[PDB]
Coordinates of C-alpha atoms in Angstrom, one line a residue:
X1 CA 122.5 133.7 142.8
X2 CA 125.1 132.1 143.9
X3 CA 128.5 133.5 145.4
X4 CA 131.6 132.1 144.3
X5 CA 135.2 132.4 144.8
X6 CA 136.0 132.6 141.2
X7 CA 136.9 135.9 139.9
X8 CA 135.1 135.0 136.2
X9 CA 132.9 132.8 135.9
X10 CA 129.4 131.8 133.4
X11 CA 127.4 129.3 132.3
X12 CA 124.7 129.2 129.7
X13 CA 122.0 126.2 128.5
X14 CA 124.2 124.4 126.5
X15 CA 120.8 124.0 124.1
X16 CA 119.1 127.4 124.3
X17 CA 122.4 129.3 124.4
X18 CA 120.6 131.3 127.0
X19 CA 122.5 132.8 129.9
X20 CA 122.2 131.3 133.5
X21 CA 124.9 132.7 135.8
X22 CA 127.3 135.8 134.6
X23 CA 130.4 137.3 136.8
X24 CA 132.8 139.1 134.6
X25 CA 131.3 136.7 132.1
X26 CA 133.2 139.0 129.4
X27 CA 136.7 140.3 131.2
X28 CA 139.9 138.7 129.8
X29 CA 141.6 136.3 131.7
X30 CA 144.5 133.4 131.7
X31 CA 143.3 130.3 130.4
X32 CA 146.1 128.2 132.2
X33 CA 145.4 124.6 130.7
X34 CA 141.7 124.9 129.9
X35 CA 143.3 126.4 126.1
X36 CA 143.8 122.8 125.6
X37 CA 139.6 122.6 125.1
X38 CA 140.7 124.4 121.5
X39 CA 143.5 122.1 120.9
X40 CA 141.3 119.0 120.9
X41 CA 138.3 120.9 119.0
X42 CA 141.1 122.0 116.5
X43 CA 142.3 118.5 116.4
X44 CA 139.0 116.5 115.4
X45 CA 138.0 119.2 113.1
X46 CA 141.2 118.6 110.8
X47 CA 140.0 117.5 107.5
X48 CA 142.6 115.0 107.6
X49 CA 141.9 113.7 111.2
X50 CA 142.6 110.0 111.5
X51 CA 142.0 108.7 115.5
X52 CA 143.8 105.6 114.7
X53 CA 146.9 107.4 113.3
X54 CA 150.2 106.7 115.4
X55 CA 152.6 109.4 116.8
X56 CA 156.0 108.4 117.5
X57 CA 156.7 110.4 120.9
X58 CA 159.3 112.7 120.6
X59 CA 162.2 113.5 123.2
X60 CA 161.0 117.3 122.8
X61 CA 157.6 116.8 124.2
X62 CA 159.1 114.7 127.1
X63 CA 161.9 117.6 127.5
X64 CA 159.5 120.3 127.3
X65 CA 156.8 119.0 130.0
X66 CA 160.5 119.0 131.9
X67 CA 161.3 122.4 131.0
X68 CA 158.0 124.1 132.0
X69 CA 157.0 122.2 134.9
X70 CA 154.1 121.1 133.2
X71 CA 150.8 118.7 134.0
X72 CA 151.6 115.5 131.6
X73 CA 149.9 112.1 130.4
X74 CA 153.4 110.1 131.0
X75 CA 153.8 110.1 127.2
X76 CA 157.1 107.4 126.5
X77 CA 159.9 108.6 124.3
X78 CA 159.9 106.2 121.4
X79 CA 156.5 104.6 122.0
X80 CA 153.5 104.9 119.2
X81 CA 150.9 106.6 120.4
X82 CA 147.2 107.1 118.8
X83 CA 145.9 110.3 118.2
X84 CA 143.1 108.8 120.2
X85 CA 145.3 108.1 123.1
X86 CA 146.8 111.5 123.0
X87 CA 143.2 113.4 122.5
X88 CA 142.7 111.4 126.2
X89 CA 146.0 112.0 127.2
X90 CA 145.1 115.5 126.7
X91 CA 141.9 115.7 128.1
X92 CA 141.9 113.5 131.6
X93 CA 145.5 114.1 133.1
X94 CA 146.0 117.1 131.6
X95 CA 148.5 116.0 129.2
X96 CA 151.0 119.4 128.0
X97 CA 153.2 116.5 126.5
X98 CA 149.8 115.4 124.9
X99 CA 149.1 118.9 123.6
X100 CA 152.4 119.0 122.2
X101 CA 152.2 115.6 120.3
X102 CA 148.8 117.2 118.4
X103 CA 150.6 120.3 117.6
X104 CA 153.0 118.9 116.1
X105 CA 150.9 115.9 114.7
X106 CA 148.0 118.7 113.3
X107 CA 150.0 121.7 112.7
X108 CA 151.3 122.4 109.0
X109 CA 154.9 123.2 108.5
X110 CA 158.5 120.9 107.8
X111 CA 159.6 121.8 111.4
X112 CA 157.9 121.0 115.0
X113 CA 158.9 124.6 115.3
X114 CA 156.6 125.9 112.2
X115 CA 154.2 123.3 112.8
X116 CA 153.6 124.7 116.5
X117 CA 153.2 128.1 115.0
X118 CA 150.4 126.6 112.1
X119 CA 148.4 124.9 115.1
X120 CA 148.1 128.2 116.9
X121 CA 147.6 129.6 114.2
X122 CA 144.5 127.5 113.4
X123 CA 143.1 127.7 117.3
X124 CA 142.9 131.4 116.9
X125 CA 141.3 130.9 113.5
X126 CA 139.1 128.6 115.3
X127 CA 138.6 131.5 118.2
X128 CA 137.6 134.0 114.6
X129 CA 135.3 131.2 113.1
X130 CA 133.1 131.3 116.3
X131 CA 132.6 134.6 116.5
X132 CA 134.8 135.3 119.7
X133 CA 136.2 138.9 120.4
X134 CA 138.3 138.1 124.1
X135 CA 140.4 135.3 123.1
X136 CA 143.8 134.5 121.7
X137 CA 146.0 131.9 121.6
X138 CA 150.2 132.2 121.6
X139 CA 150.3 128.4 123.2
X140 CA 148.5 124.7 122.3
X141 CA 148.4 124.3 126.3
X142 CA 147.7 127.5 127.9
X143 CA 151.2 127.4 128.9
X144 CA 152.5 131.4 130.2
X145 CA 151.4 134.1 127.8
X146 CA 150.4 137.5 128.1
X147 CA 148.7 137.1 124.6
X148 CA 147.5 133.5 126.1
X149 CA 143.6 134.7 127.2
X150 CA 140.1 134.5 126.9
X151 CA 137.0 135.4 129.1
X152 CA 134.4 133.0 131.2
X153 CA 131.9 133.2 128.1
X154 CA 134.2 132.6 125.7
X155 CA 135.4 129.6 127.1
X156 CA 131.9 128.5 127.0
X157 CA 131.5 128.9 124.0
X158 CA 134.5 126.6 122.6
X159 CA 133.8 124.2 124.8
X160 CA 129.7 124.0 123.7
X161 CA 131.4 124.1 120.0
X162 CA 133.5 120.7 121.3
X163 CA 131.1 119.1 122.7
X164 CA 129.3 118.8 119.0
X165 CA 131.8 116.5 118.4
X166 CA 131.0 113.4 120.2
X167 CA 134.3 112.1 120.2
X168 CA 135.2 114.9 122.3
X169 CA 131.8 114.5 124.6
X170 CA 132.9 110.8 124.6
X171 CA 136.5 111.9 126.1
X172 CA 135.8 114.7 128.4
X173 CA 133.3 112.6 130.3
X174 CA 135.2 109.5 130.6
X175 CA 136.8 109.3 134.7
X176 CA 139.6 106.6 133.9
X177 CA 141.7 105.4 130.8
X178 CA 144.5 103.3 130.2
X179 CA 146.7 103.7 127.1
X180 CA 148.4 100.8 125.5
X181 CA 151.0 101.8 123.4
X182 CA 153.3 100.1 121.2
X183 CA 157.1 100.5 122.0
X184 CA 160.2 101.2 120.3
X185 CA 160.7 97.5 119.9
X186 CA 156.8 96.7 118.7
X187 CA 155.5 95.3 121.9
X188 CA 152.2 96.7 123.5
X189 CA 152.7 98.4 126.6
X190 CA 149.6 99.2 129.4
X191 CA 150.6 102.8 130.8
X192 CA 149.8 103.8 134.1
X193 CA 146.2 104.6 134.3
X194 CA 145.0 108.0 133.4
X195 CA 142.1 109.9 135.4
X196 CA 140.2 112.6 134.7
X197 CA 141.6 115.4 136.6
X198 CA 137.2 117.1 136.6
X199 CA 136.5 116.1 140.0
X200 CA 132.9 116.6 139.0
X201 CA 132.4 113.6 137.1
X202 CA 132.2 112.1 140.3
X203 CA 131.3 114.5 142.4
X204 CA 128.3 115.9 140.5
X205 CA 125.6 114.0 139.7
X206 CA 124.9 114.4 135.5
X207 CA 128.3 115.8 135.0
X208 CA 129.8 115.5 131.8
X209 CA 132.6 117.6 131.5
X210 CA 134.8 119.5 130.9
X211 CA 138.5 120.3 131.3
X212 CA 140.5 121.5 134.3
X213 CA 142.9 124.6 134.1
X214 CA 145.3 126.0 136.6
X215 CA 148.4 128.4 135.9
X216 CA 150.6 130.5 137.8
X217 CA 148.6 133.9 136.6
X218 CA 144.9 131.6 135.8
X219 CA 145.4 130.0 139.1
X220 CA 142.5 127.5 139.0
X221 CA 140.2 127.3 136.5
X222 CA 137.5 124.7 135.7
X223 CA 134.9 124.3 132.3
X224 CA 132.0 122.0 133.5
X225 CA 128.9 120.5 131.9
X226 CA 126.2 118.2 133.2
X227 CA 123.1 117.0 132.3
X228 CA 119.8 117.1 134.7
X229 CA 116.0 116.7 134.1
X230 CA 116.8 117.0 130.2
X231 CA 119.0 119.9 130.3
X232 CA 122.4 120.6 129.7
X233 CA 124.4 123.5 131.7
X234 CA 127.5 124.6 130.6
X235 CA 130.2 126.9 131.7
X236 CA 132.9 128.2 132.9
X237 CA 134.7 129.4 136.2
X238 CA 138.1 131.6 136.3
X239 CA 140.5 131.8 138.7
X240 CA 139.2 129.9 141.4
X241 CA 141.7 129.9 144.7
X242 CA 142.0 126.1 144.9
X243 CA 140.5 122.6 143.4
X244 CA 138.5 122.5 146.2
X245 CA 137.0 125.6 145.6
X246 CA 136.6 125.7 141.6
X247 CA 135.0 122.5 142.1
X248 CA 132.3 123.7 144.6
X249 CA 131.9 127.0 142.3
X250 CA 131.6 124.8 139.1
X251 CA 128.4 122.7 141.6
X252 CA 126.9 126.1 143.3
X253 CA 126.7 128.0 139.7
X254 CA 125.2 125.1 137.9
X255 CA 122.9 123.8 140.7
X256 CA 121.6 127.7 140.7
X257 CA 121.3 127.1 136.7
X258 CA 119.5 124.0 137.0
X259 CA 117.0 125.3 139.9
X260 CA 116.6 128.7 137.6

């Protein structure tokens, strides 16, 4: 077994569901931006989901990223963006304006206010549905919250749950994307060039996924998945001290799981 600097941390066969690595596997935790897994699962499993339907960016998602010094995808106020775009404005640089957009895009309710709340609403229904007992949600982006946790298995789980999607396997494995949007006057515009902020699709040989995390009380946090020799490890690591680190924990704990 493997020692790593992560205070939580598990990972599982993604296919057997069978437990490889365990370190306060079930003690609750802050998410920091790894909530935003749920956000996109919640997303494509809308009944009304439409990848090619536009968003119109508001000044609030802009002013909030702003307001809470938080990781965003650039998102233009004014521009049209896809939910496609935003699912991978989301997912690779850790888009909180992103997050917002879906909220408000996915969430029911006649204000962004009330539709914020609805989205929630539906992660933690989402968090019910799979059977989880150490999560809840009170953000779309992990953003502060005391009522904003989950545990290292937990985490796992949602994210094996996304990844039977294979838009979202299709996203959290892809290193680089750049979004053309359409502007406030119609024209296409090429943003700046997104990149996965998981190291390990580069790093680690098979990687596949998942999604970063960091926060001022999850301090770094990673959910990884690769594929080797016909098998898929997945999990998760919580507060790691660095990117360096969570990266190397994510590589020691799923080498061990491979060798196992």
């Amino acid at each position: 077994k493997p020692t790593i600097a992560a205070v939580g941390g598990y990972a599982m066969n993604n296919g057997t569901g069978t437990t490889l690595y365990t370190k306060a596997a079930d003690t609750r935790r802050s998410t920091g931006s790894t909530t935003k897994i749920m956000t996109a699962k919640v997303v494509l499993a809308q009944s009304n989901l439409n990848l090619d339907a536009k968003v119109t960016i508001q000044k609030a998602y802009s002013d909030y990223v702003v307001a809470n010094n938080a990781s965003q995808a650039h998102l233009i106020v004014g521009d049209k963006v896809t939910v496609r775009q935003l699912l991978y404005g989301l997912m690779l640089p850790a888009g909180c304006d992103a997050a917002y957009a879906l909220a408000d895009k996915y969430g029911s309710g006649s204000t962004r206010a009330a539709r914020v709340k609805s989205f929630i609403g539906k992660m933690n229904t989402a968090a019910t549905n799979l059977g989880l007992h150490n999560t809840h949600f009170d953000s779309f982006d992990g953003i502060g919250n005391g009522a904003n946790y989950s545990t290292p298995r937990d985490l796992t789980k949602i994210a094996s749950s996304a990844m039977k999607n294979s838009t979202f396997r299709t996203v959290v494995k892809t290193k680089a994307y750049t979004a053309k949007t359409v502007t406030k006057t119609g024209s296409i515009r090429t943003m700046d060039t997104w990149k996965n902020t998981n190291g390990l699709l580069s790093s680690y040989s098979g990687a596949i996924g998942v999604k970063t995390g960091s926060g001022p009380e999850a301090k770094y946090c990673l959910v990884f998945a690769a594929t080797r020799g016909g098998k898929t490890v997945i999990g998760t690591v919580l507060a790691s001290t660095s990117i360096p680190a969570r990266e190397s924990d994510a590589t020691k704990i799923m080498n061990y799981g491979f060798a196992l």
